Amino acid sequence: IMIDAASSFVLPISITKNVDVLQRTDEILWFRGPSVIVNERIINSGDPHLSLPLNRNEKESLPGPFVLGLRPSAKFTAHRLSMLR
Amino acid sequence: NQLIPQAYISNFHNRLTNEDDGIPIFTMGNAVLPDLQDQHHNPFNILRYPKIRDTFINGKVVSPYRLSGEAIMIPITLDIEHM
């Protein structure tokens, strides 16, 4: 098992005409494998949809992925933006 | 490191024969020297003065030379042409 593989490759043809959005060298980086898309970094380790207690076939279409991400209320953020200045 | 030695520069004979310094020994900002200007403790700033990198480039390394009730003062003239 080696560590020093390249995994980043550049085609010699300069196609930098419509390429202002991708990841450039500063040429285009062409990796060996695809990317990883992660939804949220912080998990909600409580929240009994995930905790599964052992008391008492049901579905629940929860609104989006933002239930499991620990977001603060706008009341405190306004209380903190008043604490800003 | 990064320290200049205390000796081993005697660029004086070149200034004896520099023909702009008014020395009668030999014949054949806006300041010149930073003796009123600081340099913010970077020694490269002394190379901007023209009479100082003249002594760093045209300089030499010397070895140090090593060695009555009423004075009678007699002025002695020395006039020798030499090459």
Binding site: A6, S8, F9, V10, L11, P12, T25 | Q2, I4, F44
Partner: peptide
Amino acid sequence: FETMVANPIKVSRLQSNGVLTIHYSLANF
């Protein structure tokens, strides 16, 4: 386009870790 072997970009791990960013230390004329 499938005969277009690309240039590998080598990292050279010692260059990845601690390379900084000599006459300017005036002791060498």
